[PDB]
Write a protein that binds this ligand. Sequence first.
Ligand code: FE2
Ligand code: FE2
Ligand code: FE2
Ligand code: FE2
Ligand code: MN
Ligand code: MN
Lengths: 266, 266
Amino acid sequence: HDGFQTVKATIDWEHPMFKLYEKAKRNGKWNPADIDFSQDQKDFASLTSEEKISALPLVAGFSAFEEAVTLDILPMAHALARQGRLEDVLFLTTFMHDEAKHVEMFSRWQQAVGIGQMDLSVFHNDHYKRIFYEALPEAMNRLYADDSPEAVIRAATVYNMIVEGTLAESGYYTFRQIYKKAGLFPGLLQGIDYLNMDEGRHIQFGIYTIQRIVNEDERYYELFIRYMDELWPHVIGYVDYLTELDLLRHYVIKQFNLRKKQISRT
Amino acid sequence: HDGFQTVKATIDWEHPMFKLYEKAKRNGKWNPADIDFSQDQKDFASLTSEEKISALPLVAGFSAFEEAVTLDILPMAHALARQGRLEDVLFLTTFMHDEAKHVEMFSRWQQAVGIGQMDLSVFHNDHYKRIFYEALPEAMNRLYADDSPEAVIRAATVYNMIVEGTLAESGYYTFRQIYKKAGLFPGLLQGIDYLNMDEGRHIQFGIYTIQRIVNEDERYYELFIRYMDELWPHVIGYVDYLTELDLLRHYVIKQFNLRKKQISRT
Ligand SMILES: [Fe+2]
Ligand SMILES: [Fe+2]
Ligand SMILES: [Fe+2]
Ligand SMILES: [Fe+2]
Ligand SMILES: [Mn+2]
Ligand SMILES: [Mn+2]
């Protein structure tokens, strides 16, 4: 440690990520342990065997979505801390704790409805593993040895713009539509609503991070777009697998294109 | 990623660190942004120039205590995550966010009373830097390449048992005594009270971590005691410097001996 910013001076109170940190504390009070899952248990028990296995593929993708991102944000926090970006780090403590609650929430639902013992790994095909078992952890872990603008942009693209901002967002939108209409799983849907509010902040961090790097050299804009496209085939290839197993497809394309539009070449 | 625990099964609901994580969410709602510092500003302004410089040495040690530990817990989170200790990681998200609030709180006080511009690095002597600029970050950063029981015990000893559990605890106890008696700085003291409640949980993580490793091989008990003693000279050497510049001394010895007693050879 060369010194400490709050000894030499203070926090930068006007920093965008300090402002996001403040919002996260105000809006991040929900506790998954407070959700009543008593009705979700009766709902799941009421389902036919065939109706049961219809919910499980998305729920397997969910618990893994959340456990992966809980573990995989730590190298980003390390890299930004090493660059002295104290406000970013403060914000990322709320990011990481949010992901812990999301892991917790889905595991509490599984336990409540009685599928905790079932191994749901069956429902991750080849493209799902390419992203969540491979390209996500490789891009994040890179940052321990290579924190170049190229490496940070790629980490933020894979994690924030694709995993959270394209795939997970579409999955939760889809799952909510379906079961809100059925009147089923009110505990889980309240959980997803809280989760979606959290993830609004997470995507803003990804946008800020990519944009501040693009703002130094528009070459990085073309890197951003290329990594986005590089990843699309596996994004859709997981959708197809679930399908083979419609609205999920349409919303995913929309979200992917929206994320590109939130980054400006200049 | 080999798999995801909450896909294959669930969280271990009975794990001690899951229970500590639950407590942290219940008891970790305070927000430093809600503290009224209006009276602290008038108090500091009322002090004579000489009374002012009496508070500053401890406050410089404080803002650095907290900024160092915010950054320096990340390698422990990485190491335990790599070992698949999901419940420990969940808990450590509350640990890291608590430290962010502690950094924030002290920086908000400095800003409110009008010392934010002053560089307080003057008040870290040689032993303070040995611990906080050197031995703390080296022991934590080691865990990126060496997560052996020896390395984890040493990290937990330096960070949790010495930095937090011996020095910071004694400093806050001392500072509170003094100013509570004077009727001064009620905002700061409310901040320290909240901070002290948080740090109760942090020390329990350190104890759990050391004890679970000692429980595999009592050789590690003698390592624990030796690292504790290795560090004492610099612990007291910072006390002496502040003194030269009494109750702080007495409480520090007590806390040091208490921390050893919380680890059992068997
Ligand atoms: Fe997220
Ligand atoms: Fe395919
Ligand atoms: Fe702490
Ligand atoms: Fe000395
Ligand atoms: Mn999430
Ligand atoms: Mn602290």
